[PDB]
Design an enzyme around this catalytic site. Structure first.
Site, PDB file in Angstrom:
ATOM      1  N   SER A   1       5.180   5.421   8.791  1.00 16.77           N
ATOM      2  CA  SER A   1       4.626   5.231   7.442  1.00 16.77           C
ATOM      3  C   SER A   1       5.728   5.370   6.385  1.00 16.77           C
ATOM      4  CB  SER A   1       3.560   6.255   7.112  1.00 16.77           C
ATOM      5  OG  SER A   1       3.163   6.058   5.783  1.00 16.77           O
TER       6      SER A   1
ATOM      7  N   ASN B   1       0.786  -1.212   0.000  1.00 20.80           N
ATOM      8  CA  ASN B   1       0.000   0.000   0.000  1.00 20.80           C
ATOM      9  C   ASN B   1       0.824   1.270   0.000  1.00 20.80           C
ATOM     10  OD1 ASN B   1      -0.465   1.843   2.573  1.00 20.80           O
ATOM     11  ND2 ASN B   1       0.136  -0.269   3.221  1.00 20.80           N
TER      12      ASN B   1
ATOM     13  N   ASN C   1       5.032   6.041   3.374  1.00 19.37           N
ATOM     14  CA  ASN C   1       4.317   6.738   2.286  1.00 19.37           C
ATOM     15  C   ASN C   1       4.141   8.222   2.513  1.00 19.37           C
ATOM     16  OD1 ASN C   1       4.118   4.263   1.082  1.00 19.37           O
ATOM     17  ND2 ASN C   1       2.402   3.758   2.443  1.00 19.37           N
ATOM     18  N   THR C   2       4.886   8.801   3.465  1.00 18.99           N
ATOM     19  CA  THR C   2       4.855  10.294   3.665  1.00 18.99           C
ATOM     20  C   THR C   2       6.338  10.728   3.758  1.00 18.99           C
ATOM     21  OG1 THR C   2       2.666  10.314   4.803  1.00 18.99           O
ATOM     22  CG2 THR C   2       4.000  12.214   5.079  1.00 18.99           C
TER      23      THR C   2
ATOM     24  N   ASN D   1       5.414  -1.332  11.679  1.00 15.40           N
ATOM     25  CA  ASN D   1       4.702  -0.894  10.466  1.00 15.40           C
ATOM     26  C   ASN D   1       5.041  -1.822   9.266  1.00 15.40           C
ATOM     27  OD1 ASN D   1       3.210   0.907   8.618  1.00 15.40           O
ATOM     28  ND2 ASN D   1       3.655   2.530  10.144  1.00 15.40           N
TER      29      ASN D   1
ATOM     30  N   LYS E   1       5.076   3.895  17.143  1.00 12.87           N
ATOM     31  CA  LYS E   1       5.009   2.829  16.180  1.00 12.87           C
ATOM     32  C   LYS E   1       6.204   2.987  15.197  1.00 12.87           C
ATOM     33  CE  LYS E   1       2.063   0.326  12.897  1.00 12.87           C
ATOM     34  NZ  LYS E   1       0.664   0.241  12.422  1.00 12.87           N
TER      35      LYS E   1
ATOM     36  N   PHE F   1      -1.757   8.388   3.958  1.00  8.69           N
ATOM     37  CA  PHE F   1      -2.502   9.086   4.988  1.00  8.69           C
ATOM     38  C   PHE F   1      -3.724   9.822   4.428  1.00  8.69           C
ATOM     39  CE2 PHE F   1       1.289   9.940   8.228  1.00  8.69           C
ATOM     40  CZ  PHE F   1       1.163   8.633   8.722  1.00  8.69           C
TER      41      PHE F   1
HETATM   42  C1  FMN Z   1      -3.760  -0.974   3.416  1.00  9.73           C
HETATM   43  C2  FMN Z   1      -2.995  -0.656   4.685  1.00  9.73           C
HETATM   44  C3  FMN Z   1      -3.071   0.613   5.242  1.00  9.73           C
HETATM   45  C4  FMN Z   1      -2.342   0.935   6.395  1.00  9.73           C
HETATM   46  N1  FMN Z   1      -2.404   2.162   6.985  1.00  9.73           N
HETATM   47  C5  FMN Z   1      -1.790   2.356   8.201  1.00  9.73           C
HETATM   48  C6  FMN Z   1      -1.966   3.624   8.932  1.00  9.73           C
HETATM   49  O1  FMN Z   1      -2.699   4.519   8.445  1.00  9.73           O
HETATM   50  N2  FMN Z   1      -1.269   3.789  10.011  1.00  9.73           N
HETATM   51  C7  FMN Z   1      -0.424   2.846  10.538  1.00  9.73           C
HETATM   52  O2  FMN Z   1       0.231   3.114  11.600  1.00  9.73           O
HETATM   53  N3  FMN Z   1      -0.228   1.610  10.009  1.00  9.73           N
HETATM   54  C8  FMN Z   1      -0.866   1.372   8.821  1.00  9.73           C
HETATM   55  N4  FMN Z   1      -0.734   0.174   8.215  1.00  9.73           N
HETATM   56  C9  FMN Z   1       0.096  -0.874   8.777  1.00  9.73           C
HETATM   57  C10 FMN Z   1      -0.571  -1.895   9.673  1.00  9.73           C
HETATM   58  O3  FMN Z   1      -1.107  -1.140  10.771  1.00  9.73           O
HETATM   59  C11 FMN Z   1       0.470  -2.895  10.119  1.00  9.73           C
HETATM   60  O4  FMN Z   1       1.467  -2.173  10.868  1.00  9.73           O
HETATM   61  C12 FMN Z   1       1.093  -3.633   8.918  1.00  9.73           C
HETATM   62  O5  FMN Z   1       0.196  -3.755   7.839  1.00  9.73           O
HETATM   63  C13 FMN Z   1       1.512  -5.024   9.412  1.00  9.73           C
HETATM   64  O6  FMN Z   1       0.506  -5.932   9.856  1.00  9.73           O
HETATM   65  P1  FMN Z   1      -0.205  -6.982   8.875  1.00  9.73           P
HETATM   66  O7  FMN Z   1       0.899  -7.725   8.198  1.00  9.73           O
HETATM   67  O8  FMN Z   1      -1.099  -7.760   9.795  1.00  9.73           O
HETATM   68  O9  FMN Z   1      -1.134  -6.204   7.965  1.00  9.73           O
HETATM   69  C14 FMN Z   1      -1.521  -0.081   7.014  1.00  9.73           C
HETATM   70  C15 FMN Z   1      -1.445  -1.384   6.452  1.00  9.73           C
HETATM   71  C16 FMN Z   1      -2.148  -1.662   5.309  1.00  9.73           C
HETATM   72  C17 FMN Z   1      -2.030  -3.043   4.698  1.00  9.73           C
HETATM   73  O1  ORO Z   2      -0.069   4.970   3.272  1.00  9.57           O
HETATM   74  C1  ORO Z   2      -0.607   4.930   4.454  1.00  9.57           C
HETATM   75  O2  ORO Z   2      -1.498   5.745   4.784  1.00  9.57           O
HETATM   76  C2  ORO Z   2       0.079   4.080   5.430  1.00  9.57           C
HETATM   77  C3  ORO Z   2       0.502   2.858   5.053  1.00  9.57           C
HETATM   78  C4  ORO Z   2       1.263   2.043   5.829  1.00  9.57           C
HETATM   79  O3  ORO Z   2       1.649   0.894   5.406  1.00  9.57           O
HETATM   80  N1  ORO Z   2       1.639   2.487   7.018  1.00  9.57           N
HETATM   81  C5  ORO Z   2       1.232   3.687   7.512  1.00  9.57           C
HETATM   82  O4  ORO Z   2       1.635   4.013   8.642  1.00  9.57           O
HETATM   83  N2  ORO Z   2       0.433   4.517   6.705  1.00  9.57           N
END
Ligand code: FMN
Ligand code: ORO
Ligand code: AYR
Length: 364
Positions: free
Chosen positions: A184, A114, A186-187, A253, A224, A118
């Site tokens: 993240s 992804n 992605n920022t 993350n 995080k 944000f």
């Molecule tokens: C589509 C998507 C969007 C995410 N957005 C966020 C986010 O906004 N903030 C964040 O701290 N982590 C974000 N993450 C990360 C998850 O919170 C997690 O740290 C990461 O995906 C690992 O766990 P998993 O393998 O169970 O998905 C996102 C993950 C995915 C797949």
């Molecule tokens: O692009 C996001 O908003 C996002 C993705 C991700 O993997 N982790 C996160 O902290 N934010």
């Protein structure tokens, strides 16, 4: 029996077969939020209870940030059987995030990439959404179903620390714990907030704001972190977390790495990778952070969890709680599955409960 297997082997590949990933996400948020799913049947055993961060957690399996970014589906997520819910990341002002397409399935790897960037309704919207159920959440929390709120930074923000501070002031009073998401991928520039000096300044300000909140409205603060940090970065993080009395860490993350072996066609898309290929990298990060903080700093373990074994590995490595998201592949039955397998394993391995297993690899 058959509940899991109608989802793992049918409904989902049907939809994933039909629906673009972002469409699937949006429909699932909508579906979940309306409570259209049957309530989960798994009744949490007492061996799954954990007391950490100023709260009781009925089970240690949470929904990770990113699924419910805007605080829309919290109740339906508890109904699905999560011990705790984390919403966000939420940014101060609304912002659209990256252009579509921005989320990709790697089904051969059981992984996702992804780059949402944000996308957020913003603090104000999410504030009102949580206020509308604030007392219902106070009861859920008392009954062992706490709420976390994950804070991000706007893309054009000229002072990162003030974005996070505003998040503390606006959503802290509605959260059992806050997360300073400095990880993240992605920022632009965000992950440099993980460095020693930037982190100490940022977290000092965050903590001062949090401590300024009235006692009943005063959340735990967690940081995080990414899976891609140097040894020096990890050391530096542990040292800051201890110097400032940060309440916990969320580890990890998504990864900007691409492990050797990925098969999905979309493996070279820009973004954070999640799911199975992240699993052990996250576990190892947990392991290192736990040792660096002497086991005194609660860790929420996250990345690639899709079974009881995955959960217990992270718990044994030092996690007090775990989260999952990507395990989008199996649907809601995966929640009860993780929980029941984790209970079976704790019994097999001679643990009285989750609490006894936390950090057990470090005492072997
Ligand atoms: C589509 C998507 C969007 C995410 N957005 C966020 C986010 O906004 N903030 C964040 O701290 N982590 C974000 N993450 C990360 C998850 O919170 C997690 O740290 C990461 O995906 C690992 O766990 P998993 O393998 O169970 O998905 C996102 C993950 C995915 C797949
Ligand atoms: O692009 C996001 O908003 C996002 C993705 C991700 O993997 N982790 C996160 O902290 N934010
Ligand atoms: O977040 C998702 C999907 C989430 C699906 C979540 C979900 C899926 C099936 C369900 C459900 C909730 O309730 C009943 O059946 N994404 C799609 C794949 C890529 C990442 C985004």
């Amino acid at each position: 029996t058959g509940d899991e297997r109608f989802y793992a082997e049918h409904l989902m590949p049907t939809l994933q077969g039909l629906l673009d990933p972002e469409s699937a996400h949006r429909l699932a948020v909508r579906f979940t939020s309306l409570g259209l799913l049957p309530r989960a049947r798994f009744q949490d055993s007492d061996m799954l209870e954990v007391r950490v961060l100023g709260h009781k957690f009925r089970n240690p399996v949470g929904i990770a940030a990113g699924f419910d970014k805007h605080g829309e589906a919290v109740d339906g997520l508890y109904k699905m059987g999560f011990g705790f819910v984390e919403i966000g990341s939420v940014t101060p002002k609304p912002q659209e995030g990256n252009p579509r397409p921005r989320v990709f399935r790697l089904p051969e790897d059981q992984a996702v990439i992804n780059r949402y960037g944000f996308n957020s309704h913003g603090l104000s919207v999410v504030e009102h959404r949580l206020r509308a159920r604030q007392q219902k959440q106070a009861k859920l929390t008392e009954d062992g179903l706490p709420l976390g709120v994950n804070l991000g930074k706007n893309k054009t923000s000229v002072d990162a620390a003030e974005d996070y501070a505003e998040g503390v002031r606006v959503l802290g009073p509605l959260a059992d714990y806050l997360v300073v998401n400095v990880s993240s991928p992605n920022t632009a520039g965000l992950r440099s907030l993980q460095g020693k000096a930037e982190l100490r300044r940022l977290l000092t300000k965050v903590l001062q704001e949090r401590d300024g909140l009235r006692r009943v409205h005063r959340p735990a603060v967690l940081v995080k972190i990414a899976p891609d940090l140097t040894s020096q970065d990890k050391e530096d993080i542990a040292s800051v977390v201890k110097e400032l009395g940060i309440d916990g860490l969320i580890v990890t993350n998504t990864t900007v790495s691409r492990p050797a072996g990925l098969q999905g066609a979309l493996r070279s898309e820009t973004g954070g990778l999640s799911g199975k290929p992240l699993r052990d990298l996250s576990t190892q990060t947990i392991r290192e952070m736990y040792a660096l903080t002497q086991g005194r700093v609660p860790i929420i373990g996250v990345g690639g969890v899709s079974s009881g074994q995955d959960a217990l590995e992270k718990i044994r490595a030092g996690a007090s709680l775990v989260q999952l998201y990507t395990a989008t592949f199996w649907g809601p039955p995966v929640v009860g599955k993780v929980k029941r397998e984790l209970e079976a394993l704790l019994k097999e391995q001679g643990f009285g409960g989750v609490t006894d297993a936390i950090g057990a690899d470090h005492r072997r």
